[PDB]
Design a protein around this ligand. Structure first.
Ligand SMILES: [Cu+2]
Ligand SMILES: [Cu+2]
Ligand SMILES: [Cu+2]
Ligand SMILES: [Cu+2]
Ligand SMILES: [Cu+2]
Ligand SMILES: [Cu+2]
Lengths: 333, 333, 333
């Protein structure tokens, strides 16, 4: 009887940050209540001022990461304000039935709905918008996120022993297909509907114009770099709703990687690079052993450094000359 | 001595269906005899009437699924009728030696050959045509299929316990590269030879014009949807002879997945999406828990919903409100 | 104290060959000293005479394979002769800290540097050039290789038992983006700097013009085929620094495959094809059971047979009619 389970409301936070949660469940199964508000908005995605009509869950690209435990119930209130112009819905890869929920959550502008599903499988999963006839357009306009379903006793290593993270970050990787004029300049549009016909032609080339973390070129660099300290254990959740990616931490590794994101499987160890298929979320665990700046990239290095799929870690602490040292600094022969 | 083994002739069925077989072998190793007839034919691949010169095993795209048990012998009689115009052969990824058999099975129109090989490794494997100098052209014209080599004691889960399927379906995913005129219209040709020079240029862009299940856009929708019932255990074999794919069951999961298709390895559990590399066949096992329509897609959603890589399951049974329910139906705020 | 460890200098050999080494370590941890010299050079990559400005470690594409054991120290002396025109560095995916070493190894023409790092994780790993602002350009100009860090007790199978190879080969797969004129002809340039602006536009299409093994179309065919004998156990190390690949041995298998190249994980068994993500090195182990010619390809067959990603094995020995035989040779019906 769901009527007799405890309920908790959770307010979501903007990526790359993640709302507070317990790794090991302290209570029994609960109904976890979330609310998301759909927002269609103009987004500037590169340093040149390229502007797109993004379609977002809660105003961010990606949508926020939701965290629950196995066999909790997720209750999502989904609001489509009448200032929006399009029909939207939501499809949880974590859920069983009704096209992930998409058949039960179609909301026109000015409508809302509340969906509930049981989180029967532990792992990280994608959620995305999926309205009939327009699925790729909404997803590649930024309307995707992820949900993490933790095992009730937390994460384990390949030998069944507990793994505990100190920090968790969520990196949503987005491929964008911005229509171009005949000379190669990106087009601007007044409304989302105006862009549709050009957007379809652009999608059909299968060649993204931009591939970004957290909605924009450089969004996770500079003052917005991810931070950690030597000795800290960091979980990085990475999702790609449409296109394969291959994350790599430059100067580090994935000590424990669930590349396809499902926690009943044992992790891969010591990865340099791992493949997250389009339509999947993965998770990688690393313990920092050296301070300094790290780059986190899609290791198709064109996609990373030309199209935008690169971010930074800033890590503090003491340098370890046992692991690495410059014996002879660069000098003339 | 092969002369003293039992022999059985098997007649193949058209995909997505699979010829009758036993999951657990009831006899010892046998010589399993198959016959396939090559057919070059015109095929209409989309709703707009786009027509291509397909090259097929047994008149279908994909070719039929063959099922044998580990350490059986496969004896294939391959017929190239004199109404065809091209040299063909066959390369089994399941076989050891002579380029998978391709060196021993070259048949001009009006020729036939009989090849035998021992199926020493359990798994699902691709077979495809591979004539020297023209391999990609024949494969991307539809001349590929798959063969399943079952362990003699059947499928097992990650703990070594028996897994038994109630239904099996074979989904062959095909990338097509239809030449286009300067305005973007697809070209028609009178014979396969006429298309060759344009087809090579089209293949070299590495961008498919169509990606389809079972030979055509919508081939597995409508009246041709795959069917199942709540509680039934379904094995879906998926092959892609040329290009990576990432299957996903919308509203479901891969409970047990051999993404690279080889049964001596333990399955991945609880997959939302899995990557089948080009040149590989994979298999996914799912038990349906909710009725209704499911979509089965390549989760590059452009490839699925714009280029054709989507099919349907129709599943009967009782809806389970514990797993999913609409608490508040879509309504005005 | 590094001052008290033994030291050995190792001279590198040109791929596909690999410098001599022990599979099982006979000594304790050592400082292994390597020297590499950067060479910018013109390279002819296809039969049509297409010429590119390659950027190489030690004059080859790929750079040479380095072999050490877990917890050895690698000491690399890196020389950038004043006949070169560009800044270069090196990033080891095997190393921890300072962007894989790239932050500590920037050398202008006429400069050298010596870097040391501890090889704490067993596996095959990519190394590549990575100068700030120009990373994809240097990598896709051929400036990448691999390093193998063997477990001190050698390779093991999925049950922990020793696997020993008789021969080892290194296949470096390179995607090239040669700029083209309006008619589709490849452009020539006098210096690397002259090509930069065109090369960036070419890279941004994400469509390689050539994909080759060992620096050129056909580099591993003919007299340069890899060789083996029936009964020999062969380790093939395969790297791709920028783009996914899916190797396949035509007529054979990967008996034991570490697709993401990391030896603390158990191998995948009986693979027909496996995916090596861009930015990764993998390793496959096979025992030849049939003589003859084998093709080793990227099983995107367009990339293999149209763009260049195919090589040959020549294998000697006795044919085994139990595994495969032509029952009826190709003949008229
Ligand atoms: Cu939407
Ligand atoms: Cu989806
Ligand atoms: Cu053929
Ligand atoms: Cu093949
Ligand atoms: Cu360089
Ligand atoms: Cu790298």
């Amino acid at each position: 009887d769901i009527s007799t389970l405890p309920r908790v409301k959770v307010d979501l936070v903007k990526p790359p940050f993640v709302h507070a949660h317990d790794q090991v469940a302290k209570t029994g199964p609960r109904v976890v209540e979330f609310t998301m508000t759909i927002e269609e908005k103009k987004l500037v995605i590169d340093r040149e001022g390229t502007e797109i009509h993004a379609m977002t869950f809660n105003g961010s690209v990606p949508g926020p990461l939701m965290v629950v435990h196995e066999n909790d119930y997720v209750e999502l209130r989904l609001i489509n304000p009448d200032t929006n112009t399009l029909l939207h819905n939501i499809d949880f890869h974590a859920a069983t039935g009704a096209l992930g929920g998409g058949a039960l959550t179609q909301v026109n502008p000015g409508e809302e709905t509340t969906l509930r599903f049981k989180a029967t499988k532990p792992g990280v999963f994608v959620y995305h918008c999926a309205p009939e006839g327009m699925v790729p357009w909404h997803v590649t306009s930024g309307m995707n996120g992820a949900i993490m379903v933790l095992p009730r006793d937390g994460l384990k290593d390949e030998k069944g022993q507990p793994l505990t993270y100190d920090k968790i970050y969520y990196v949503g990787e987005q491929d964008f297909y911005v229509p171009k004029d005949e000379a190669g300049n990106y087009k601007k549009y007044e409304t989302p509907g105006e862009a549709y016909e050009d957007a379809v032609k652009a999608m059909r080339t299968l060649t993204p114009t931009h591939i970004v973390f957290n909605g924009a070129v450089g969004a996770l660099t500079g003052d917005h770099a991810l931070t950690a300290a030597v000795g800290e254990r960091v979980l990085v959740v990475h999702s790609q709703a449409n296109r394969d990616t291959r994350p790599h931490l430059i100067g580090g590794h994935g000590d424990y990687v669930w590349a396809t994101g499902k926690f009943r499987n044992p992790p891969d160890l010591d990865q340099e690079t791992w493949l997250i298929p389009g339509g999947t979320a993965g998770a990688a665990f690393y313990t920092f052993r050296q301070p300094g700046v790290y780059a986190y990239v899609n290791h198709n290095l064109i996609e990373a450094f030309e199209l935008g799929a690169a971010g930074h870690f800033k890590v503090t602490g003491e340098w370890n000359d046992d692991l690495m040292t410059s014996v002879v600094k660069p000098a003339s022969m």
